Design an enzyme around this catalytic site. Structure first.
Site, mmCIF file in Angstrom:
data_model
loop_
_atom_site.group_PDB
_atom_site.id
_atom_site.type_symbol
_atom_site.label_atom_id
_atom_site.label_comp_id
_atom_site.label_asym_id
_atom_site.label_seq_id
_atom_site.Cartn_x
_atom_site.Cartn_y
_atom_site.Cartn_z
ATOM 1 N N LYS A 36 -12.640 -41.666 -11.913
ATOM 2 C CA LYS A 36 -12.010 -42.186 -13.118
ATOM 3 C C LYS A 36 -10.551 -41.774 -13.252
ATOM 4 C CE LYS A 36 -16.373 -42.255 -15.672
ATOM 5 N NZ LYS A 36 -17.102 -41.807 -16.888
ATOM 6 N N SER A 55 -21.935 -39.082 -20.499
ATOM 7 C CA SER A 55 -21.198 -38.269 -19.544
ATOM 8 C C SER A 55 -22.174 -37.479 -18.685
ATOM 9 C CB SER A 55 -20.241 -37.312 -20.258
ATOM 10 O OG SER A 55 -19.365 -38.014 -21.121
#
Lengths: 190, 212, 252, 186, 224, 210, 143, 205, 205, 218
Positions: free
Chosen positions: B53, B189
């Site tokens: 990311k 997450s």
């Protein structure tokens, strides 16, 4: 409003309704356009846009035939029709339209039938129908790839008799055209 | 030219007819650290257990995004191309302020229709910079920033253990701990932690799977 | 370059919206060019949804005299035979509209073509006057009488270019030419052009159509055709006979 | 089948009243002695009101041992209409009569919840804005003989009908002593 | 604009035998909050013309800019634009009405109500009104907003017909307008005590009074 | 969304005389049960023996009249000061009205004048442009009262053909008086324009000032 | 001094609003064959159901340049906008390459876009009629 | 405002005093109930002695401020240092010409030799008002009476600093969208001065 | 709040001082932008030395006040003079048990020989709070900071009168629904005292 | 009590093909208090929508021989509520053998209107005299009451209130009060389309019989 198409081993038979518009009664074909001497197009759907689209397609195909002094294949005609239909609705609300294209490829000497819906999905089919809500039962149970023209006409007559069994007097009849190696003919008796 | 509007009416007609992450940035006394989680989920399902990311605009300017993934990637790539061309034209190291201006103007041009919320960290000859960019064209400056669905736990961790004078190791540990808290306490997450550290006068250090 | 310099030099005119050429032409500020455009220009609101705005501000009956006039359209029937075309309409209406002459429900496009009025009256009147002007220009250019098919197609294209904008009109162009014979076309605001032999439009269209179909023959007489049309009208009375020399009024 | 809607006209003469209703059986005017009532609106509600008022007037005559006066009947109708405050009938009633003790003609009108609208000249129910109230006002003259009042009300009905097809009317002329019922099968 | 944000209350005007009198309060309210207390809503345009604007403050400032531009352009390239080229109230009102109608036709109107008052060149009184829709009308007495429902009945009792204008003096008209302003201050939540007045006369020429407060208020009966 | 339409509530009447034409209009301007104005012209003289009136939205009617007058001025300028006929004016007004087909005027228009035969001619225009030639035309809320009053006395088949200018003016004034006595929105004044071969004459009759 | 494009709607419409595709038989009607838009696209459909961002995007850079010219006129005078417009017109008029649609280098230099990329540059953008050199020549020279 | 767009729920106070002007604000940016940023610099510098504070949409106000700063740089390249009136006029023109699509409100505090420091306010809609002092934001509604009661003309520097500190402390106390530190910029003839006050200072006033 | 009702948009204050309590209010009742009643006595009395001011819906508050006065009359017949806490409890129960049907808010001021004057506030919802002073109404939001900066415990009668007068004058000045005269009731050991202040007196403050 | 039957049927008829007939919605009402009594006046013109229905309407209701009221809103609701409260007041006065008080009628009206939660559309001005003096109150349809010296109500209430604010003072005589009320009603008539014709007046003084005047202006 129903359009029918049957592809027999050496011919294409296209059937359509005669005439109906709003609640106005008329005596009086305005749903079949001769794209090419061996390629016919039958259109059904919303009134006003479908006729304009059919005339535009016919004009383009006639222009191509005049320029090249040659007859475009039914597959290329179907691809062009699909592309034009997809382009016409790329910037506006889609309109209801269904197109049956029936031709006789002279290079391969083979009949061909194609169906295009309102979004531009071209499908090659042995038989096709639109406007009926079924009729595919007869078209599936009594269909053979090697049917002759007479057998296809008999099957179409059975389908027309089925149609003229649950409809009011407004059902004037069915106009039938045949595309084969000799060209395009219109059937009056059947 | 540009992004097309074709088939918009067709898409609306079909729709009417029934036809159908934790990121932190910490600024320390001689640079900036940006950390992120490494889980990509297509809803409930975990599509990828190790995803990068941390995207790069310039060799020493990095960013991490949220919102619409395609929009974030496209905008980051376009701004990177513009930054590279500007640096080639000027023969100078790119500045984070220039990237901030380009991103702000591009996002304000589309009036919020391009959904991309970014944390942009970098080091240029003027110093170290850390910015947060909203999808409507508003940008903010801070010392520590958080983003994503796990941003609340990360912000709690950052508020607990932040000081003015932090060394490189302390900043790396703080970013890792914030990402770990986001990973444990948030369902969106998970997996590993990716870190990117940028000092003044040194190459950017990119550590994938810093803590597995 | 001087025009460029002028375009960058300067408020009162801007607020009056006279800096636009269209506003100046529509108000005859600098000339009479507004009455010089062969294709008329129609004003639309400068908003995102003109169509729904017009529909909402038209379907609001507050003043009877501020409403848009609608054609009568009680019963109109047209047919063709060897002697030409017979058209029959109703002379039925009062409503504070006292006039010297009776209301004409058939538009006289030209001395050779007739246009039936239905739906919105203003649309039919305006667009058939425009069609007559176009046909006259075509006849002047080609030195020949324009065919009925050409005029019907022109009207169909015109009404199709404004499809869904708010027009509500349906007409039956009737004509007789040496090239084609007797021809009747039907064109509505949707965009449908339909060639026909027997047409019946109105509230009592079904009975008139049945009466016509009961005793319809291609080979008949003018008196027989007129009597059949009058009887079909009266089943549910102005008459028009269109021949190669033109249209003659047989009202009774 | 249809039936719903209609018009009622009430006019006051010298010593008489005139009450008229339209007609295609089903008549919108009912009498409970020497008091007449015409109701416009839903046929079901008209029939319900007629039955209820016949019930109440029969009980009143049995108890009081006398006929019911137009004023008392007007008050009764107002109260009965107000009872259905939140479920009111889709009706407009008009009451006409002659007081048997003083002789003064009485006419009154009501809304759907019994608000009394008493007029000294004439009352129009059903339609009072298209072509009836204005024509009745134009054709009205106070202190008319029973024949003059009958002619006036017939002319008003004809004018309303014109503004032809199957049309009829029922007219009641009420004096202190006798009542005359006439039709207008024209 | 789509909707006004900061607005004014009302402007009231009337005719007397020698001219006109106009008045308007000084207040700009931000919704239910009386925010600004220094807004002037009476603009003296030219020599003997007064324009009163009620409504959106930004559009009022735009109209004031337009009026200033008109005054400057009329005297532009005209050294003698002081006696025969002086702007008459009719021309200013015609320009304003045309602007309002054109912007209404553009679907972007100005959220204001405008009253133009003054004395013509030949001494005739001029008093006209226009709204955001562009509709204009004239009357011996005019008012906007709540003043159209409370101040108008008070003023019409003094000047009810055209023949009543020569019978009405300046003192009577001024007293009537002051009383109307006091009544408006009594029964208007958005009103303000302070107001400005303008008298346009065919003899004196003009008299503009500011910082006027409503006096002689009766509140003693509240003791009971 | 902003609403740009409205109504002012007037009344107009146009009568075609044998050698003249009469166009009369009422004055009243009230809205939301509040009195706004009572004095405003409703009948305008366009010249060339043409008289025009528009009833409805005040701004729309004023704009239409202004546009027609400008068009007449340019026609005079570009055609050696040729006089404009009544039918040509009717065609021009039809085109002006239909130029706003999708943003229509909320007004009703009546014009009157003399044709080439010297006979009085009156034309009535629908809001979007549908026009017709009529002998008598009443528009507004009081038309349903004025028209029966006229039909009761005179005949359009004392016959209207033999009526005089003074007789027609008297009949119109009496019709407006009757409407005022029966209706409630007619009064204040009555502005009448009479078109004869000698020109245009203005008559302002003062009704009750209520 | 605009930021977002304004007045993007059309006040009036007509059948001959596009003079380049007028039919030769009837000059008051559009030619559907040479339009090559599919043959079922009336102009009315272009007035309703549009994306509320298409107009903003198609008129963004023009609005920014107009605001810049207005600022120059307010601060520098008429000469600066006059010269900028003159240079842009000269560059645009002297370039005619019918086989490409990419802009010239000089145009990008004048617009200060030598090292700037937008989605217009990345995505610049069969038919039997009207796609040859002669059509572009006629459009360019007004023939 | 648009859906999902950041709104500037601030507390802004500009006060003119004998030697110039002071512009002060808080430092909180919120997302409804979550504080996105505890410390923000809401004092925007448009020119060397012309500062402003913004309210409404954050993106629109930032774009307007950038355009105004560019315009003032262009003006300075020609005629030197501009005036507060010119900057206020540019702000007003940009806000009024774009009020149909942008939501923005500005408070401009400036200083110049001619005018000796001025305050202008441009609320939503695009109208400019020149005032001795101005207050704006969500918390400003809670200190209208306090500011009205405790304002004087030609105050000293310390008196104005104390007035702004007290008023902003009350606004922060009663409003949930106002933050910790108070930032003030003093524009005088000597130069530009920056002051910061912490909660532990003003909460004990 | 049901559609078409009357809202009690006002400026309500209650201040406790050394010798008792003082309850103050304005006298304006508006229906939209129109002042329906410019002379209104909003100082509702529920017992000889227990007073209240109402907000929300006029009908619901009047019904609740009538029921509370009935309850206090029964209590006085049985046990004698009630304390302000009992009246506040009855008000709170009535407001809380009907909060799904009635919108009502009360400020209760009272005095007794033991507690020596108390102030309670029942906002919308039905909760109760005991405070040294209370403010309520639409116009209160503009004086919050002021009320936080000028209140002292154990003020004299004159100081409390001046404080209430100034605060209500500011609230009247900045609120569109607040105006008219100022009415104050002083509850002490001596008795009940009525005070009225006219606009020409408090507008000069 | 009042029936709720045919509620669903009426809703179905409204939602499918039928329109419910409208109810009369009543027009200026004023009340002025002078040193020794009260005066209540009302306009006499009643219009059915845009059409005048009557030029002489009695909108003054009687509760007690010295307690009167005038109502706006739904005429049927106003009349029914006033008559019910009058019956209750008469029964109470018979029970106590005393003259009825205005406060008792006010309490009854307020409680009755609050019972129906505003579904009864009656807005009243109630004036009267009793052994305790002269009283004037205004009652809202939701059950809230207010006290004043001069009150106005109806469509033309703003003009009447302006007139009252113009020419009202504490010390007024009977003739001056009647003139002031007539002037307020006249202003409401002239400057509004909802009022017209004559004026109905009722004067109640302390120690004297109530005086009722019909068509005071002629």
């Amino acid at each position: 409003d129903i359009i029918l198409g049957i592809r027999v081993q050496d011919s294409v038979i296209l059937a359509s309704s005669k005439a109906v518009t709003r609640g106005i009664s008329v005596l009086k074909d305005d749903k079949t356009r001769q794209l090419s001497p061996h390629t016919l197009m039958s259109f059904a759907g919303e009134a006003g846009d479908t006729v304009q689209f059919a005339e535009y397609i016919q004009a383009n195909i006639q222009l191509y035939s005049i320029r090249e002094d040659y007859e475009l294949s039914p597959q290329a005609v179907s691809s062009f029709v699909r592309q034009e239909l997809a382009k016409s609705i790329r910037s506006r609300r889609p309109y209801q339209v269904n197109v049956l294209i029936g031709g006789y490829d002279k290079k391969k000497n083979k009949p061909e039938l194609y169906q295009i819906d309102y979004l531009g999905t071209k499908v090659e089919l042995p038989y096709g129908a639109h406007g009926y809500s079924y009729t595919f039962f007869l078209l599936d149970h009594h269909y053979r790839p090697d049917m002759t023209t007479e057998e296809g006409l008999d099957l179409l007559k059975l389908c027309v008799q089925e149609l003229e069994k649950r409809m009011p007097m407004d059902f004037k009849g069915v106009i039938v055209k045949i595309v084969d190696k000799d060209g395009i003919r219109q059937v009056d008796d059947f | 030219a540009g992004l097309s509007f074709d088939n918009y009416q067709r898409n609306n007609f079909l729709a009417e007819n029934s036809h159908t992450t934790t990121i932190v940035g910490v600024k320390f006394n001689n640079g900036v650290v940006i950390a992120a989680d490494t889980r990509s989920t297509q809803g409930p399902i975990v599509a990828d257990k190790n995803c990068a990311k941390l995207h790069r605009i310039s060799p020493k300017i990095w960013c991490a995004g949220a919102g619409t993934a395609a929009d974030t990637e496209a905008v980051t790539q376009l701004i990177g191309s513009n930054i590279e061309l500007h640096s080639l034209y000027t023969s100078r190291e790119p500045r984070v302020v220039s990237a901030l201006q380009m991103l702000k103007q591009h996002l304000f041009k589309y009036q919020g229709h391009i959904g991309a919320y970014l944390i942009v960290a970098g080091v240029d000859p003027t110093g170290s910079h850390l910015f947060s960019i909203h999808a409507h064209g508003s940008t903010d400056v801070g010392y520590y920033l958080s983003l994503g669905s796990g941003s609340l736990a990360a912000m709690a961790v950052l508020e607990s253990h932040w000081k003015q004078d932090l060394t490189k190791e302390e900043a790396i540990k703080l970013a890792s701990d914030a990402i770990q808290a986001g990973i444990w306490n948030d369902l969106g997450s998970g997996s590993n932690v990716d870190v990117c550290v940028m000092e003044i006068g040194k190459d950017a250090e990119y550590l994938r799977n810093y803590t597995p | 370059m001087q025009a460029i310099a002028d375009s960058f030099s300067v408020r009162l005119v801007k607020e009056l919206q006279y800096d636009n050429e269209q506003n100046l032409e529509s108000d005859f500020v600098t000339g009479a060019s507004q009455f010089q455009r062969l294709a008329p220009s129609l004003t639309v609101p400068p908003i995102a949804s003109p169509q729904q705005f017009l529909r909402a501000h038209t379907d609001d009956s507050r003043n009877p005299d501020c409403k848009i006039k609608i054609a009568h359209g009680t019963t109109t029937l047209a047919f063709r035979f060897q002697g030409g075309i017979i058209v029959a309409v109703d002379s039925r209406a009062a409503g504070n509209w006292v006039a010297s002459q009776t209301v004409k429900k058939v538009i006289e496009i030209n001395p050779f073509l007739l246009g039936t009025m239905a739906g919105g009256a203003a649309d039919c009147q305006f667009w058939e006057t425009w069609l007559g002007s176009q046909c006259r220009l075509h006849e002047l250019r080609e030195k020949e009488r324009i065919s009925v098919a050409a005029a019907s197609k022109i009207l169909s294209n015109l009404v199709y270019q404004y499809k869904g904008a708010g027009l509500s009109m349906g007409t039956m162009i009737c004509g007789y030419t040496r090239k084609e014979g007797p021809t009747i076309y039907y064109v509505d605001s949707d965009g449908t052009r339909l060639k026909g032999d027997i047409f019946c439009v109105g509230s009592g269209q079904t009975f008139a159509y049945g009466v016509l179909d009961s005793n319809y023959k291609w080979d008949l007489s003018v008196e027989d055709a007129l009597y059949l049309g009058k009887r079909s009208i009266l089943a549910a009375v102005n008459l028009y006979h269109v021949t190669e020399d033109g249209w003659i009024y047989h009202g009774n | 089948s249809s039936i719903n809607g209609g018009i009622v006209v009430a006019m006051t003469g010298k010593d008489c009243v005139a009450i008229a209703c339209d007609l295609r059986k089903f008549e919108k005017i009912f009498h409970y002695g020497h008091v007449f009532l015409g109701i416009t609106g839903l046929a079901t509600d008209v029939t319900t009101l007629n039955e209820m008022f016949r019930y109440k007037t029969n009980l009143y005559k049995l108890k009081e041992e006398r006929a019911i006066e137009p004023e008392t009947f007007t008050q009764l109708v107002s109260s009965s209409l107000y009872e259905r405050r939140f479920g009111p009938y889709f009706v407009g009633p008009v009451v006409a009569g002659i007081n048997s003790k003083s002789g003064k003609p009485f006419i009154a009108g009501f809304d759907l919840i019994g608000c009394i609208d008493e007029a000294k000249d004439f009352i129009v129910s059903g339609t009072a804005s298209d072509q009836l109230f204005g024509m009745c006002e134009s054709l009205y003259e106070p202190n008319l003989e029973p024949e003059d009042l009958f002619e006036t009300i017939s002319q008003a009905l004809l004018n309303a009908a014109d503004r032809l097809s199957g049309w009829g009317a029922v007219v009641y002329i009420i004096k202190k002593d006798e009542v005359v019922k006439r039709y207008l099968k024209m | 604009t789509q909707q006004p944000i900061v607005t004014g209350t009302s402007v009231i005007s009337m005719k007397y035998d020698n001219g006109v009198i106009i008045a308007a309060d000084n207040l700009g309210s931000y919704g239910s909050l009386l925010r600004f207390n220094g807004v002037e809503r009476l603009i003296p345009v030219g020599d003997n013309t007064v324009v009163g604007i009620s409504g959106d403050i930004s559009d009022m400032q735009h109209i004031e800019r337009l009026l200033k531009d008109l005054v400057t352009e009329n005297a532009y390239d005209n050294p003698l634009a002081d006696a025969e080229e002086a702007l008459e109230p009719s021309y200013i009102f015609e320009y304003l009405a045309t602007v309002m109608y054109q912007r209404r036709s553009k679907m972007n109107p100005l959220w204001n109500a405008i009253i133009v008052a003054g004395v013509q060149s030949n001494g005739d009184q001029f008093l006209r009104y226009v709204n955001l829709l562009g509709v204009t009308y004239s009357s011996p007495t005019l008012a906007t907003g709540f003043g159209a429902h409370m101040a108008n009945p008070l003023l019409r009792k003094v000047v009810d017909r055209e023949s009543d204008i020569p019978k009405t003096t300046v003192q009577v008209a001024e007293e009537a307008i002051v009383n109307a302003m006091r009544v408006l201050y009594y029964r208007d939540a958005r009103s303000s005590r302070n107001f400005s007045l303008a008298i346009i006369d065919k003899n004196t020429g003009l008299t503009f009074k500011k910082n006027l407060q409503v006096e002689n208020m009766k509140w003693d009966f509240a003791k009971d | 969304q902003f609403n740009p339409y409205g109504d002012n509530g007037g009344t107009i009447l146009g009568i075609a005389g044998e050698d003249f034409a009469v166009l009369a209009g009422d004055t009243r301007n009230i809205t939301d049960y509040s009195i706004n104005s009572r004095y405003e012209p409703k009948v305008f003289d366009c010249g060339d023996n043409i008289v025009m009136s528009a009833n409805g939205f005040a701004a729309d009617g004023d704009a239409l009249v202004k546009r027609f007058k400008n068009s007449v001025k340019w026609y005079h300028f570009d055609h050696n000061d040729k006089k404009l006929s009544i039918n040509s004016a009717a065609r021009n007004i039809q085109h002006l009205l239909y130029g706003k087909r999708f943003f229509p005027y909320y007004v009703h228009t009546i014009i009157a004048g003399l044709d080439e035969d010297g006979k009085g001619a009156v034309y009535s225009f629908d809001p979007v442009g549908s026009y017709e030639r009529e002998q008598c035309r009443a528009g507004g809320a009081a038309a349903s009262l004025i028209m029966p009053f006229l039909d009761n006395q005179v005949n359009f088949k004392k016959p209207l053909k033999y009526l005089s200018v003074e007789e027609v003016i008297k009949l119109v004034r009496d019709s407006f008086t009757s409407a005022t006595e029966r209706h409630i929105q007619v009064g204040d004044g009555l502005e009448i324009l009479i078109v004869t071969k000698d020109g245009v004459r203005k008559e302002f009759y003062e009704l009750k000032r209520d | 001094m605009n930021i977002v494009p304004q007045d993007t709607f059309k006040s009036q419409v007509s059948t001959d609003q596009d003079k380049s595709v007028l039919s030769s038989a009837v000059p008051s009607l559009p030619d559907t064959l040479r339009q090559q838009e599919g043959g079922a696209v009336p102009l009315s459909t272009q007035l309703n159901d549009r994306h509320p961002l298409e107009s903003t995007l198609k008129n963004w850079e023009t609005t920014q340049r107009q605001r810049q010219m207005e600022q120059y006129r307010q601060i520098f005078g008429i000469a600066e906008p006059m010269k900028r417009t003159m240079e842009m017109e000269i560059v645009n008029r002297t370039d005619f390459n019918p086989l490409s649609t990419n802009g010239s280098i000089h145009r990008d230099i004048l617009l200060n876009k030598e090292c700037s990329i937008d989605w217009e540059d990345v995505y610049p953008g069969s038919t039997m009629v009207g796609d040859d050199v002669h059509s572009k020549i006629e459009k360019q020279l007004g023939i | 405002l648009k859906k999902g767009e950041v709104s500037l729920g601030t507390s802004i106070m500009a006060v003119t005093f004998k030697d110039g002007v002071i512009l002060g604000a808080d430092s909180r940016t919120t997302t409804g109930a979550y504080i996105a940023n505890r410390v923000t610099d809401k004092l925007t510098r448009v020119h060397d002695k012309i500062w402003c504070c913004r309210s409404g949409s954050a993106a629109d106000t930032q774009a307007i401020a950038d355009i105004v700063q560019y315009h003032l740089e262009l003006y300075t390249s020609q005629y030197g240092t501009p005036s507060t009136e010119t900057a206020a006029s540019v702000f007003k023109e940009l806000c009024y010409e774009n009020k149909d699509n942008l939501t923005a409100g500005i408070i401009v505090a400036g200083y110049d030799d001619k005018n000796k420091g001025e305050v202008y306010t441009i609320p939503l809609g695009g109208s400019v008002h020149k005032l001795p002092y101005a207050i704006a934001g969500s918390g400003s509604t809670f200190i209208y009476g306090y500011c009205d009661k405790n304002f004087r003309e030609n105050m000293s520097k310390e008196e104005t600093v104390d007035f702004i500190k007290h008023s902003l402390s009350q606004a922060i106390k009663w409003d949930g969208s106002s933050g910790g530190v108070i930032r003030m910029v003093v524009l005088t003839a000597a130069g530009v001065e920056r002051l910061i006050f912490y909660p532990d200072e003003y909460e004990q006033l």
